Write a protein that binds this DNA or RNA. Sequence first.
RNA 1: UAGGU
Lengths: 192, 56
Amino acid sequence: ASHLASIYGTEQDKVNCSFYYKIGACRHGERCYRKHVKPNFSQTILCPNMYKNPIHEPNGKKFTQRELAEQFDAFYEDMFCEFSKYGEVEQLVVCDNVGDHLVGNVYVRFKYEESAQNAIDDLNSRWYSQRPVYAELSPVTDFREACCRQHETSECQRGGLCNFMHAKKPSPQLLRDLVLAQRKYLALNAAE
Amino acid sequence: ERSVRSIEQELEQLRDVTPINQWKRKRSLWDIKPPGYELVTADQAKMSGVFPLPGA
RNA sequence: UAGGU
Ligand SMILES: [Zn+2]
Ligand SMILES: [Zn+2]
């Protein structure tokens, strides 16, 4: 009795795609009959199919577990550093799915909405790993409502074809060194 | 003003961390184009259809 | 047109 109930962006909302409202990518894409509302102002950007996991290649079944961890850290390091030139980065998530709408997707949430707009304006003209970069604003705000719950604990029984984000987390050493490195870069540009 | 004080309060705690704009990336794959595409821009490559997304 | 309010 304190507030009116609603079903916006929910799985019970049958005119808006709930999966695009929370995850930022739907399995049907442009052919979905439910609404995909693309924001004009957003803090989160999307780079679809940017992380090519070597495990899903014809010859990438030769690396050990330690070599795989350093390779993924080399990718996350290369991602976080480049996105930091467009402003402050609050969170960076990399999806390890195989579905055509979420495989290797890279989500970046900036602190300011103008920082996100300047990022997609420049990324759409750049390259990465011999491939053109696709960039767009994504309606994702809270990653907890988009991550797979049964994947954080143990593994999801749906495997790589899960429609929720199977985020591949990096090493804690790299994540800590990146947040501290960004704070110094922001402090050194504030002293003027 | 306390802003300049708080700024030079955190820089000293970060005396032995490299700022992110300096970090030397050994093999960064940014701006690396496929062979022959040195004159092709990224926008022309997407419209050409040779680089489609997995959804299409 | 789903498993996630
Ligand atoms: Zn949809
Ligand atoms: Zn899952």
